[PDB]
Every structure is written in C-alpha cells, then in structure tokens.
Point group: D2
Chain length 339, copies 4
Amino acid sequence: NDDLRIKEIKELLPPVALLEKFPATENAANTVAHARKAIHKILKGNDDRLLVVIGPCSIHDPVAAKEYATRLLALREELKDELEIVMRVYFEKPRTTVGWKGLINDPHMDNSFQINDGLRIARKLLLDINDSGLPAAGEFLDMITPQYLADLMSWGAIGARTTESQVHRELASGLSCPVGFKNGTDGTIKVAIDAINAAGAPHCFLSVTKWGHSAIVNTSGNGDCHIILRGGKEPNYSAKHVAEVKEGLNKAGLPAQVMIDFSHANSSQFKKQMDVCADVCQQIAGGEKAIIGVMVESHLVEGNQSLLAYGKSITDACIGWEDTDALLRQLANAVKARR
Amino acid sequence: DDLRIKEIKELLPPVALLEKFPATENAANTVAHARKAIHKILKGNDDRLLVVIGPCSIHDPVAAKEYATRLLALREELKDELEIVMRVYFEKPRTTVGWKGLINDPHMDNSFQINDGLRIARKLLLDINDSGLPAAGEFLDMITPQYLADLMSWGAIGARTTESQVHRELASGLSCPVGFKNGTDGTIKVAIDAINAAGAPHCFLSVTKWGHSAIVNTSGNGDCHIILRGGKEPNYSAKHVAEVKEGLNKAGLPAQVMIDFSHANSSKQFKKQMDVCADVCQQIAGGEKAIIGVMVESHLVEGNQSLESGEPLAYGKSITDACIGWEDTDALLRQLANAVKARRG
Amino acid sequence: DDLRIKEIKELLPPVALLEKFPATENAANTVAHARKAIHKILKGNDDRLLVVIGPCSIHDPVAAKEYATRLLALREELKDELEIVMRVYFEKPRTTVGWKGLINDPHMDNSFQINDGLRIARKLLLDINDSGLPAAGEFLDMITPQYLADLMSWGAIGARTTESQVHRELASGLSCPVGFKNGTDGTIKVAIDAINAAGAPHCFLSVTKWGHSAIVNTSGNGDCHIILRGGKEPNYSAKHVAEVKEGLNKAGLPAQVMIDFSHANSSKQFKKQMDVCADVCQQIAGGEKAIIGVMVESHLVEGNQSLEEPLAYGKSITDACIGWEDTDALLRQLANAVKARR
Amino acid sequence: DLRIKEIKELLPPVALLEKFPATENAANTVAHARKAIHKILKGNDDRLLVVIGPCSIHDPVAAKEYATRLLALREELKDELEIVMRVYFEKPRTTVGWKGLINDPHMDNSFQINDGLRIARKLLLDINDSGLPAAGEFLDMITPQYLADLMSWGAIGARTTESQVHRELASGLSCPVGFKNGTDGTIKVAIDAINAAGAPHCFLSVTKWGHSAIVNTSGNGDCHIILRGGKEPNYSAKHVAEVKEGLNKAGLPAQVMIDFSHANSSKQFKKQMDVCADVCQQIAGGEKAIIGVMVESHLVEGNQSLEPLAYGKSITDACIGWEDTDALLRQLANAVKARR
Ligand SMILES: NC(=O)N/N=C(\C(=O)O)C(F)(F)F
Ligand SMILES: NC(=O)N/N=C(\C(=O)O)C(F)(F)F
Ligand SMILES: NC(=O)N/N=C(\C(=O)O)C(F)(F)F
Ligand SMILES: NC(=O)N/N=C(\C(=O)O)C(F)(F)F
Ligand SMILES: [Mn+2]
Ligand SMILES: [Mn+2]
Ligand SMILES: [Mn+2]
Ligand SMILES: [Mn+2]
C-alpha cells in the first residue's frame, strides 16, 4: 500500500561528501565563529551596534553574488564600529503555491532539479564568501539541507509560513547559530513569541545525520532567538508597533528586542524600504535601544526579473547598490546618535 | 556543527518495522478499500459521509483497541450511511512545549524511547486495520510516515503546518487522501493554496524506507480537501460553509468540506461537539451535499486529564484535548447516519 | 567506474532481520550454554566429544526441522559423552561454479532472492535454537554473519579460505568458537597460522547491523582450533594425529584436533565416514585425549540427488551424506568410545 | 558483540570520490592503460607488461619520487614495455603485521583508516594525473570502491586465489586482474579462479554510499596467471612450458606473467636479476607466451623493520634499488626487440 504517488527516487550525496570536498578554511571558520559570538553579544544587551542582515532576496547567479559580497565587504569593515554586517545568502524560497524554490532545489532554473549540483554551488559560494570575512545568513526551510551549510551560517531565519510549525522550532532548537522568527502573515506576535520559547527548550526528534542516515537527535535549546517584524495586512515598523511588541515581549518573559525587516509586507515596493529606513533610523537616533537589527533586500541592480539581466533579483524587487550604500550610512549614524 | 546538538542515537529504518509488522491480507484490504471509498466520496460518486472520529491522541494501546472494537461495530452497523475511520494520532503539535505523542515519547516521561514508539504505533495500526477498521492520522513529522503510511487510509496536515512547504510536499506523494485545515485564525486561503500545491508534482529531499536521504519525485495528490476547524469564532455554520464553497469554486476546486466538530469549532468545549453536530446534521438532512466529512474527538470516557500531574492516569480518558465519552459518541454517530439518510430523500 | 557491474539491488539490513526474528529466551540460552560448553572442552576441563553433524547444505527447512527433532533426542540421550551440534550450513563454496546455498538462492533456480534467503535462513536457525539444538555454520562471505551469527554456537572457515586475511579477521571478531581446516594440499601450516592470527586483535572494514560500512576493532578469538579434513590422502589415522599434535606444540597452541569424517577423509564416499568413525573411535577408546571433535555429513536419507522436478525428501542436493540409521549408530559408537576413554 | 571492541565511523567512497575526482588526465592514464593491457592480453602487441614498484607504499613522497623516475622509463621504453607502477596499499600477512598504508597510515597501530584512504586516493590520483598507470593487490572487499577508478591492473593475493569472495570481486572489477599460483606452487587454484572471474556472479557488496547491496557482475575476460614460485621457483622455460599446456588444456590462452620476486626469487631480493636474465633469454628465443612481468623495486635496495626510517627503503619485502631497476627494464626492453 506504498508509493502509488512516489514517481522516482534518486541518489543524493550525504553531507560528508560536501564537507570533504569543500572543507571550511581557517578564514571561513573564523568569520563564522566571530559573527556568531558578536550577534550573541548584541543580543544579550552588551553591544549598542546594530546587526544588518542584507543582500539579495534569492541567489541564482554565483558570480553576481560574489561581486555583491565584494562591495558589501567594503562597508562591513568600514562601518564595523556601529554595524554588524551579514550577507543575505538565501538558497531556499518558500512559494505561496508553485514555482522555483531556489538555487539548491533547481540551480539551472529549468525544472531540472539537479539538486546534487545545487548543494555544490551553494556550499562553495557560502565558503568563498565566508573566506572573504563576510558572514552569511539564510532561511532554513528544508529539514535536510542545513547539514550541508549550517557550519557556514552565522544567523538564520524561519519563514513566515513555517514559524508556527513544530519541526522548524525543533530545527531552531539545535542550530549552532542565532535564529529569528518572523511574525505571522496575520500580523500578530504570539506565534513568533511561542516559537522563540519553543526553540529555547531542549527537544528530541528525528533528523538526518551528516552521513545521510536517519537518527534520534537531542538538542540543547537555542537562547539566541528573537522576533523579526515583517508587517501584516499593514506595516508594523512604526514606533507604536515597536512599543506594542516590547510590552508583548515583557509580558511573555522575553528580552524586549526586535529586528525590523524593511521589506516584504513592511514596504507593501522596494523603494519604500528606504522610507522604512528613515522612520526606523529616527527611532534608533532618538534613544530606542530595543531595535537590535534590521533586514534589507538589496542587490547590485534594483528592481525585479521574471522567467536574463545581470545582478538583478529574479524573486522579490530589491534596492540597487547606490541606494544600498546610502541606507547603510543612515544606519551607522542612527547608531552613532544613540551611542 | 553540533554546538547545540547534545546527543545522537540509532534509529531503526522503516524496513525493519515493515519486516517485523507486515500488513496482513485483511489489514491491507482495510487500507485499500477505505482509500477508494473516500476517493469516491471526494469525487461526488457517493452520498455517504466520511467520519474521522476517535481520541485526540493515542497514549494507551489497550484502550485504543477497546475503543476500536466498539467503533468497528458501529462502522459495520452504519456503513450504508457513514464511512467510519478511527482517529489514530501518534503525533501531537504543541503551542509551545509538551508531550508530542506516543511515537516521540511512549512511556510519557521524557524517556524519548522512539524506537519503542514506532514499534508500539505500528503494531497498533496493524491490529486495528486487521480487525477491519481504517485509521486516520496527522502527518506532522517528515520521517515517521515511512513507518506507518501504508496502514493509513486518510491523513491531516495540522493547522499550524498547512502553510508549510515541506508539508505540502509530503502530501503530494502520500498514498492516502489528505485534508488541510484552515488557519489558526480562520483563514481559508492557506488551505486552498495547500490543496493546489499538493495536487502538483514536487521534487524534494526526503528519507527512504532504508533510512537514507534521497531526491524524491511525486505525482501530486488529487484526493485533497479542506477541513473547517474554526478560527476566532466557529466556522461550521451554513453561512461559513457557503463562503468556503464559493471560494473553492472561485479557485477552481470542487466545493466540498469536512467539518471538525472539535478544537476551535467547539471553543475547545468538548460537549459542544454535540451542538456542532445538531447544526451540521440539520444542514445535511436539509440537502447540503458539500459536507463530505466530519471530525469528532471521542474516547471511552469523556473529558481529559493531565500527564503533568504525576498521578497514575484513569483508563480510556484523553491526556490531551477533552473528548466526548462513548455514550455520546454512539448517539452522535447515529444522528450523523440519520442525517445522511434524510439527505437521500 | 562499474563497467563490469550490471545491477545493484536493495538488501535488507541485519537489524531488519533481527527485528522480524529476534532470538527467543530459549534460543539465546541454547547459544549461551553451547558456546560455553565448547570453550570448556577446548581448554581441557571437559572430556566430552564435540560432534558437529548434519546435512552438507540446507535446501529445505522442513526436512531440516525433522532432522533437528531426531538429532535433539540423541543430544539429550548422549549428553554425558557428546556435545551434539547440528550442521546448519547455508553458504557453500565451490571449485568451479554452482548453487551457493540457501541464503544465496533459496528457490534453487538462479533467482538470487537473497532477501528471501536470509529470511528463511534466520527463521530456520531461530527455530532450531528455540527447540534446544545448537547450530554450526560455515562463514564464507563477510556481510552475512551479521544476520545469523547470534544463533551460531560454533563456526568453520572454509578450506579454501583458511589462508585469507579477510577471513581470519572475521574469526577474530566472532562470539562463537571457530575451527580452521587444513589446506586442500592437506598441509597443516596455514591452519595454525590462522589460529594465531584469529587470536590477535584486529582492525578492518566491515558492515554494521545497520547495513553501513564502518571501522571495527576485534579482541581476538582464543576458542579456535584445527579441523582435519584430509588432503591428497585421508589424514585421520593415529599417525596423522601424531604429526599434528607435534606441530601444534611446535607453535605453542593446545594440541587438539577436530577430525572431519567426510570430504577428503572419506575419499568423497559417504559410506566411508563409517570407516573413519571406527578408526577414530579406537583412538578415543585408546586414550587419545587430544581429539576434541568430529564433523559428520548426516541427513535423514543417505546419498544425494541432483537439481533438475520434485526432489527426494530429506536427501542432500550437495554432497552425499549418511542416512539416519547410520547416524544413530555412529553417534552411539562415538559415545561408547568416550566412555572407554574414561 | 563479545569480541567486538569498537565501531568507529568511515567516510563512504563517494566522499573520497568527491574531494578527489579524476582529472581529465588521470582518467586517460587509466583508460589507455586498461585498453593497452587488454590489447596485449588478446595476443595483439609484441610488448611486455612490466608491473614494477615497491612491495608496499608507506611514504607518498618517496613514492612519487619513485614514480616520476619511472614515468621517464615508461616514456623511453614506450615501444617495448607497457610500464605500470606497483602502488600497493594493502598487505596480507602470514599471521599478523602492518596491513599497509590504508589500515595504518602512521605505522603506529592507531589505524587512522579515514586518513589512510584520503592519503591513498590522493597519491593514486597524482601518479595517474602525471601519466603513469597504477596497480595494486585487491585484498579487502570494502576498499575497492575508493580506489578502483584509478587502478589499471590488479592482483589477487596468493593466499586468496582460492577464495570465492575474491573471485567474485574480480568478476566485477573494471581493470585486468592477475591471479597468483598458490603458495603450494601449484597452478590449478589459479586456473579455476580465472574461469570463475570470467563468469557472472551475484553476491553481497558495499556501494559507493557505504550501503550493503546485492550486486550482479558481468564476468571478467581480461584475467591471467602470475607465476610466483612455490617450494622452488617456477620461471624456468620448463615450468613455463608446463603451465602453457595446462592452460591450453583449460581453454584459456597460454599466457603468463612471471613475478621475479617472492618465492621465485628464493625470497632473496638480489636474485630478481638472475630471474631477469633467464626470463629475458626466453623472450629473446621468440617466446610469445610471456606477456608481462612483476618486479619489486624502490629508490634504494633492501628492506627495514619497525625509531625513524631510512628514506627510500621498503618496510616489507626487500626490493632492488633504482639503478638495478633501470638496467632491469632496459634488459627487458631489449629482449622484446629481439623477439620483434
Ligand atoms: N526573508 C525572505 O525573503 N522571506 N520572505 C518571507 C518568507 O519568510 O517567505 C516573508 F517575510 F515575506 F514572509
Ligand atoms: N486533530 C488535532 O488534535 N489537531 N488539532 C489541531 C491541529 O491541527 O493541531 C487544530 F484543529 F486545532 F488545529
Ligand atoms: N564443512 C563443509 O561442509 N565444507 N567443508 C569443506 C568445503 O569447503 O567443502 C571441506 F573442504 F572440508 F571439504
Ligand atoms: N604481491 C606482493 O607484493 N605480495 N606478495 C605476495 C602476494 O600474496 O601477492 C606473495 F606472492 F608473496 F604471496
Ligand atoms: Mn524576499
Ligand atoms: Mn485535539
Ligand atoms: Mn560437504
Ligand atoms: Mn612483496
């Protein structure tokens, strides 16, 4: 009574294959370690600096990403006294129903699903970027792919559609990096507050080891978890909403910190991310220590592409690079003000 | 990695449980007949009502089997009006933390004796199917289905994972029909998207019956439907059914629904499923053909009790959501059967 | 790669056959007690003879169980003289090619339903042990022992594999005592060489109960010994035992032998096993204390038959065996020869 | 488990194959070599096949020093000798001992077998990428999946010619395989294994993924005998003649590889030159049945026991030095010119 609806089953490389081929260098290992220890500090109250997770919405061209990482690394070491810069290196995309799920799931973007390649491309891109000294951040959607990338990851996000799901709260509970939970698409805070609490508890569940086998896995629990404001049916980045989310966090016994995502439902329109910036910057300038981080969808070329132009996102519309240089400067100064 | 991964333990692969507990001939009949029976209802070629009914969670095989024996007697007595499937749920999703079900923690004490769990779960599923009674479950975990899916005639994606891509993927290659719940706030769109997503073929990483990860390709599942489970308010009434029916048609899908009488549709008041039932029976007996199914939370004894006390538990009583007891369950099933008869006619 | 490999098919992992067919308590006691009794015979502290006796190969579980029932009766009746251990050999090695046993081709038709074979083999092994009769097998390949070795109270390494590093490694990790047969030349050297190696600890690649390759480290097996099985000519005579007693001291291991009444020692004539028995008995009845064991090819029905129709019940389709009547007489002769040595 | 002490984990072949893929180059080294040994084996190349190199490999630097020297001779004697280097990673013992690089890469009994494979696959990949074919003993059942794609010719140990699992292995190997006569210096055991290895088999093995599987093989037609001596050597044109008839009687081509070392050598490494003279006389005398030759050679003559180690010197069987090696191969190349 098995596998009427399973078409084909193809061999998949275990993580140790991707680990052996592409070990972490000394630089990669250290970039990761330090950014993780930093975001801990910024999260336990002991750094006025602002974490800036920024980069494209999805990666499809490893050359464009390599160029972007080049540029962003300049301002990372430039603004290091106010900002903690981390690059958006997003290989998995959650679809409302149907479509391209990203570089790992379909690297050639032709529904060829040469996943084994996608795992090579992604791991090498992630390793090279960490070797620059640029730390990386991704969304953890699949339960199996993290074993190939998690050691190259300084920070992670759970997507708005899976924030309530127990299997992702289990995953978060065992990641060695800090984790952020987006509010519900229904705008509200509670499912992300439950998720933080769930992901801080020890969990025991079924996962796949570095060998590609199934096993029983115990996790310690992840205390480095925080909310990510992303908007609802209307945006929720305003100074009213922050204070709302602070009380809500204090009620639920959790640190009153927040990361505001300039994009998605918070900009309804990529240009609007810039208006969120001033609004949010006014708050950070005007003594608002509750904002511990920010999320921006930025690429080389602004705008959006569909299914082929260079350095332009094929998923969400991003701000181009000129705008990106401006935005990172407003942030480091809002931080300068607060300090 | 493994900074926050405390400990790793060996897990029996699916083929081990399958070899230890193969479907008997009758068990496999039960699974095969129930799936086609449901598929026929979903296609509109049967005026009968699918009824998924039983404990919120299984924590004691002894009372699970006592309950299955009583349900099977009614399933045979009423089979011209109802297609009775017992809730046999081994996975429980929590708002934050708590007991995640019999598989994850069979002895109910954070021993996490998962191999035992799979052994107890599959033997129980086997015993119930061999007896003639089909089983339903929530598909919550990405790895447990390989151990149990061939003894499952129907599954549910829970309200907290309906929007989850991996859950929509899992349903697209499941052998059985699958119901998708509206969102914990009462949102119909997530579930309709879920049905469309699950109807489509997918390609994604999963774990095989050999316990090894692999690239799997699915054909899509056509036997998917919405479940109305309440939001802020209940959404079982005529008014809401009409909205869901219209929104299915507007999305190009058959306008048919299963209504859960429990959870938010009862405001978590177990006796209120008797009132959801009265209203829903009247809709059916009055001519509503879109109600193809209902779900009820039922046990041997009504109410519930809490593991977390530390006392030894009463027999045959839920340790999760409160359920109606057996006497109410028998009456509910007869009303449902009677309403289906009246709809005929 | 794999220009000469045509197909790869899936293989049930050991843990799946251990879960379908777990040892019963009875079966596990059979293996525990038997393993222990043999180890005590092998170090001197028991004068009984160890008798490994049964079919050349199992091709039919039904006749095998009838054989076990009859053999079990005699195990009890002679237990003060004989430690009776049923030959349950699945895997068979061949000089050219041919049916490699029940595990490899249970349906005896070149279908290679190995999963079925392992299911049948473990089921049969489990039943025989569960009834109280301990079993002995040959270990030929490296992957199958995980599926069966927990129901094995004694083992043998093939005459064609006694010089094998891979086979001496395996013997070092086994929980049962293990005999090594002399070379097809009939020379004894490689046997002792193999008893020394198996006694040492080893580290080698092997498969786990999970069907995965892993690195394994073995303690080493000190319950090993030679099996005399002839060469160019039979080598069971008292003069031959003398030469091998002498060589076993020259190497510093206990001067003991198991004598195989079959194969080269009977010139491949199943009836001649009765003549080997008479000669060995007079050695035992002669005070020869260093003969610790015997191996007999025995079945319900003497002789053999070829594969082509239904077959004869209880009659070997590999090597010719003695039938039950001679089996009963030959075991009584061996018992009385034990009584005489005391 | 009573006699099992520990179960460490093990990279699956596909991990080694992925960190250390075959270069375009190394892929051609093996493709041509394999096809060359095949053409020589189908009686179709006046040339001899010398399998020459250390008894065992225990130092990848000393070893690729050796290799780069022997690549030159391969380039020079290219018209008389198909030269193949002896890259042996696994050693069968007569009881206990050091099983070679893979089992114990640091010779300290720590059994870092995961490093052993990494080291070994790196070495082979290099020697092959430079242009030089490789050869080894196939003793273990699990190791072949890490290394075989860089093996041009393989040998089955003399203490394993009679073992079913090794005949089974050879039936699936993609390279040609030689079978040593047994230690009893007798030839039937090898003749059987040649027939066995040519047939399809079906048996349990392990995949590139580290999983137990059921495997069917096609059979191996590129197999031959290796004369290795017994209680006395067997390289004589008399012994050769005896094997030729016995092999014709068996339906196999009368063809022979002569191993100059081990029992043929009286196990005295310097005698390999005596055997080399006498074997050359046969190749000179038009003898077409000697298709290949095996010699144990290293940078420096002799052997040593297990305190650090003399560079260049075998840790197992004593071998001849490099200059004796150079003269031996030109000795061999000349006799092929005479035959031609
Ligand atoms: N971080 C991302 O780009 N993801 N986008 C989202 C997701 O989680 O799907 C969103 F915030 F819109 F919900
Ligand atoms: N059947 C169950 O107990 N599940 N309950 C639910 C779930 O799907 O979690 C609910 F309906 F509340 F959404
Ligand atoms: N014990 C067996 O049945 N097999 N024994 C032999 C074999 O390898 O056939 C032997 F060589 F001893 F005759
Ligand atoms: N071929 C080698 O270098 N090792 N030695 C042998 C082998 O077993 O192959 C030998 F011939 F000595 F037995
Ligand atoms: Mn986006
Ligand atoms: Mn419930
Ligand atoms: Mn026999
Ligand atoms: Mn040597």
